[PDB]
Design a protein around this nucleic acid. Structure first.
Ligand SMILES: Nc1ncnc2c1ncn2[C@@H]1O[C@H](CSCC[C@H](N)C(=O)O)[C@@H](O)[C@H]1O
Lengths: 150, 285
DNA sequence: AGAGCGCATG
DNA sequence: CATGCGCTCT
């Protein structure tokens, strides 16, 4: 099946084409404060939903936890049915901007301990349902379940 | 033929167990009452006043999905998260996302774990309470997470104090008009002990701060007694909130301690007003 | 224990 | 404009 993706707080469309997921099927929102459940359902059922905190040293009005909570919210909005029609995965990425308390909250909410991925102190954390380059390897495995347009 | 069963309650941020108190007053038979509290004074009050009926759990953020599944299904889920980082009465508030504010999401979270799975047609009721004096951003965000708009209820209409509060939830008839009862004490005078004269008919919102008892600009003493002005006694304050007399007289607590408990508390007639239609949904004792 | 600060907000 | 599920600091 083709691509169906929901991107939050960051756009991986440029990366989605690079790893071979583009063909219009991607949706991107910056401010999700006024986004309801219907707004998520009406954009068609998504197979994968992505969201990530801005790189630290970037400018953000929002607290580190805001991204997490909004992500979890829209995530619960995006999940399908008790019956499982197709494969559904999710991914949240921390750019080392999350406090110990906040990343503990993240692990509590997403019911999963983060996988930490190093660059080679320029590393990133990730929570994902999966069974830049180094984590691009994490963007990779989706090709087995979803057709690639190479 | 489905019969009515005793009610199963999960109470987050339980305080001095206003929920169980009201439920029992309404004659609603309580199967189990599981409370999440961390303040030892409050937990003591709940433990003593309801004789070990309350099953206590630790921090709310130590409660997991497996716990909800294991602690049976819940008919009712009620909670009021701390508002010291939400209320505009606190200049140094850290907002909904930092400090104690984020605890709201802990309610949110747990609610969805307790919500009966799709294809489950059992009755599920939930109630979330917080203050009106909060920032518009935080209020909107809370409304977005709970996917609902709050209902403002003011205890002024049914008690001897101002208590404008937002209530999110799905209890039947949340928007219905409040109705005074013969048991209700609407004037401060009705709350006082013998030989005491009330300067006021209603008092302003009672916080945990001692001088929230003081009225208006000039910080007037609320009562006058035998050639000497005075503030509210803890018993009088209990009466104002609608609690039974000497409810918080436990654990050798000072005035400030009791008031710290009550200032964070619920207005009993308000919660009774909200839980009132539930006595028709569950077994009566 | 009690007084001051704080200012967005309905 | 009067007001507040509080903190701080004696
Ligand atoms: N992390 C936490 N986990 C569980 N309870 C907490 C908590 N942090 C604070 N609390 C409790 O949550 C309460 C919120 S005040 C609400 C009290 C209650 N609704 C009543 O009617 O009295 C406080 O009393 C506080 O003791």
């Amino acid at each position: 099946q083709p691509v169906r993706v929901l991107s939050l707080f960051e756009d991986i469309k440029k990366e989605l084409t690079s790893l071979g997921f583009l063909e219009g099927q991607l949706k991107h929102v910056v401010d999700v404060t006024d986004t309801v459940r219907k707004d998520v359902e009406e954009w068609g059922p998504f197979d994968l939903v992505y969201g990530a905190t801005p790189p630290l040293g970037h400018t953000c009005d929002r607290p580190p936890s805001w991204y997490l909570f909004q992500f979890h919210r829209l995530l619960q909005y995006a999940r399908p049915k008790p019956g499982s029609p197709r494969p559904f995965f999710w991914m949240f990425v921390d750019n080392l901007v999350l406090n110990k308390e906040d990343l503990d909250v993240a692990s509590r909410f997403l019911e999963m301990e983060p996988v930490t991925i190093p660059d080679v102190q320029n590393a990133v954390r990730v929570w994902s349902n999966i069974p830049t380059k180094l984590v691009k390897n994490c963007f990779l495995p989706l090709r087995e379940y979803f057709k690639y347009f190479s | 033929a489905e019969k009515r069963k005793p009610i199963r309650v999960l109470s987050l941020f339980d305080g001095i167990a206003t929920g169980l108190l009201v439920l029992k007053d309404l004659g609603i038979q309580v199967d189990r009452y599981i409370a999440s509290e961390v303040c030892e004074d409050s937990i003591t009050v709940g433990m003593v006043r309801h004789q070990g009926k309350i099953m206590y759990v630790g921090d709310v953020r130590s409660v997991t999905q497996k716990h909800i599944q294991e602690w049976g299904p819940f008919d009712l889920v009620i909670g009021g998260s701390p508002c010291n980082d939400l209320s505009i009465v606190n200049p140094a508030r850290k907002g909904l996302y930092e400090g104690t504010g984020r605890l709201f999401f802990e309610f949110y979270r747990l609610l969805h774990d307790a919500r009966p799975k799709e294809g489950d047609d059992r009755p599920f009721f939930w109630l979330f309470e917080n203050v009106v004096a909060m920032g518009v951003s935080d209020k909107r965000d809370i409304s977005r997470f709970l996917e609902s708009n709050p209902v403002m209820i003011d205890a002024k209409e049914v008690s001897a104090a101002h208590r404008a509060r937002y209530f999110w939830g799905n209890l039947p008839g949340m928007n219905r008009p409040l109705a005074s009862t013969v048991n209700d004490k609407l004037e401060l005078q009705e709350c006082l002990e013998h030989g005491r004269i009330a300067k006021f008919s209603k008092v302003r919102t009672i916080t945990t701060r001692s001088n929230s008892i003081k009225q208006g600009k000039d910080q007037h003493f609320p009562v006058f007694m035998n050639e000497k002005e005075d503030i509210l006694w803890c018993t009088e304050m209990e009466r104002v909130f609608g609690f039974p007399v000497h409810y918080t007289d436990v654990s050798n607590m000072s005035r400030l301690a009791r008031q710290r408990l009550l200032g964070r508390s619920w207005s009993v007639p308000v919660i009774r007003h909200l839980f009132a239609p539930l006595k028709e949904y569950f077994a009566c004792v």
